[PDB]
Design a protein around this ligand. Structure first.
Ligand SMILES: *[C@@H]1O[C@H](CO)[C@@H](O)[C@H](O)[C@H]1NC(C)=O
Ligand SMILES: *[C@@H]1O[C@H](CO)[C@@H](O)[C@H](O)[C@H]1NC(C)=O
Ligand SMILES: *[C@@H]1O[C@H](CO)[C@@H](O)[C@H](O)[C@H]1NC(C)=O
Ligand SMILES: *[C@@H]1O[C@H](CO)[C@@H](O)[C@H](O)[C@H]1NC(C)=O
Ligand SMILES: *[C@@H]1O[C@H](CO)[C@@H](O)[C@H](O)[C@H]1NC(C)=O
Ligand SMILES: *[C@@H]1O[C@H](CO)[C@@H](O)[C@H](O)[C@H]1NC(C)=O
Ligand SMILES: *[C@@H]1O[C@H](CO)[C@@H](O)[C@H](O)[C@H]1NC(C)=O
Ligand SMILES: *[C@@H]1O[C@H](CO)[C@@H](O)[C@H](O)[C@H]1NC(C)=O
Lengths: 272, 243
């Protein structure tokens, strides 16, 4: 007997006959090509492969949701690629393309798709895709709107008081749960760094802030005192003499290492 | 006198030790010199301590009514007289001992204040205060110092009382001590400068204060209201209250 399954001195044995994509030992239907290359329109989101072929997606990223011969584009924002419908030959193992869904230019913004994703506490933009097909992406920047809180140097702030400016660092809007980048201002303020794990506690507005010194220079602290401790058990005893305005005698207060002067009197303290 | 039987005058050159002279014919001695050293009585005159003295002592003979005067003798000293033995060339004016550029004894012509060359010093008066020892002073001897063998003070140096912006004045604002001496001082400027003395009297003291934790030489904005400076020690900032 003869197999009699051929495409055109010494065949496919198929993919077409158990479909009319292509026409079908010396002594041995037509090919309907219409709709071989389908160009995906700006609003294209659903395609069905002919001859019950499997859709093979060769694109920029994964947006496709496939079921048998049918497939659907889910929020394909900026997606470029091809969706080739294929059928295999059992005896040779080679595959034949019945239809090619092509997208040569990136898809524009699809209406109803969310292009923002929250990763931890930071709100990121979706460079590619949307919804569950979103691909992150550089952190979203603050353009405007009502701010709930601002996280700077690892501390949360809700007021301009005690801060160099406002808003600072990463700030969360009342609209979103995620934080948006506002500034990259340094925590090292006049040789003092605002660090989450520090040496001394101090207050900025209403927030308890931890600080570490970089230099031992006589400089200001970027915060207000955290807690003030009154001696009432440490005692205070001192000696004083009469002097001239800003004129001092040789001894420097042993504990303070500075000439203690007020108006016309010099002081020397002793602390228990 | 040999004027009546030579009317022409005589010439006498004063020697280095010449002190006494007598005018002939009872003539009056007219002294034309550098300064007053002469002690005259009728025709006789005395050169009291002439040290550096140059001039002439002309014996002028006068008649009346005609005021015509003829010189019978001229005592002359062209070169200055050297030091006369027995004459004192130092005069005390107040407390300061001055040198005699010309003359000696009561004929002394004051010169610049005698300077200290050497010898045992009794005391040193500087800025109106007496000092007998080097402690608390910039150097010693200072200003004008009196020797043991003398009564007057000799100039040692010309160091100022006003330093560094503080005046050591006999009548001052605040009392302070230099060695063992009680010194009065006045301020010239209100600059943050040192006092040239030690405290006169130390008075011992209630005292109450507040403190917080801070970083090494790192301060919070409020300066202690009284002291007007950031009270810092190690890792703690202070704020005092004195009631
Ligand atoms: C796309 O396809 C599958 C989805 O599970 C995965 O193996 C592959 O890594 C995805 N591609 C990227 C870039 O994540
Ligand atoms: C994207 O998600 C929204 C709900 O958040 C939904 O209404 C919309 O249909 C989704 N779009 C696609 C293409 O799945
Ligand atoms: C409201 O939330 C949306 C989230 O897409 C954001 O684009 C918008 O800017 C927020 N509103 C304001 C006032 O910022
Ligand atoms: C302060 O007073 C005490 C008690 O009189 C004394 O022992 C101490 O030396 C004094 N300190 C100074 C710097 O004068
Ligand atoms: C010399 O001293 C004064 C002038 O300075 C004068 O009064 C005095 O009579 C003079 N002495 C004599 C003895 O002439
Ligand atoms: C100068 O005074 C001394 C001491 O009084 C005396 O010994 C001396 O003779 C006096 N000399 C003259 C020339 O007056
Ligand atoms: C006092 O001593 C000094 C030398 O130190 C000397 O110059 C001076 O003439 C002396 N005076 C008397 C009166 O001895
Ligand atoms: C010091 O403590 C007292 C009592 O608590 C308080 O009245 C005063 O304001 C405090 N001063 C400073 C500078 O904190």
């Amino acid at each position: 007997y003869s197999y009699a399954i051929a495409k055109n001195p010494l065949l496919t044995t198929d993919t077409m006959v158990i479909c009319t994509r292509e026409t079908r030992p010396t002594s041995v239907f037509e090919g309907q090509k219409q709709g071989d290359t389908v160009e995906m329109d700006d609003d294209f989101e659903f395609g069905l492969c002919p001859c019950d072929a499997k859709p093979i997606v060769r694109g920029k990223y994964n947006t496709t949701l496939l079921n048998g011969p049918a497939f659907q584009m889910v929020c394909p924002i900026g997606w470029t690629g091809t969706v080739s419908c294929m059928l295999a030959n059992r005896d040779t193992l080679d595959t034949a393309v019945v239809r090619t869904y092509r997208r040569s230019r990136p898809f524009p913004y699809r209406q109803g798709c969310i292009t923002q994703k929250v990763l931890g506490e930071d709100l990121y933009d979706c460079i590619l895709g949307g919804n569950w097909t979103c691909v992150t992406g550089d952190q979203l920047q603050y353009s405007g709107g009502s701010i709930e809180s601002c996280k700077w140097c690892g501390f949360k702030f809700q007021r301009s008081e005690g801060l160099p400016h406002y808003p600072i660092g990463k700030c969360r809007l009342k609209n979103e749960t995620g934080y948006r980048l506002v500034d990259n201002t340094s925590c090292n303020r006049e040789g003092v760094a605002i660090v989450p794990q520090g040496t001394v506690k101090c207050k900025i507005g209403d927030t308890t802030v931890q600080v570490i010194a970089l230099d031992t220079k006589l400089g200001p602290m970027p915060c207000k005192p955290y807690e003030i401790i009154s001696s009432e058990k440490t005692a205070c005893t001192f000696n004083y003499t009469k002097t001239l305005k800003n004129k001092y005698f040789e001894p420097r207060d042993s504990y303070f290492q500075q000439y203690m002067l007020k108006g016309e009197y010099q002081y020397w303290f002793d602390l228990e």
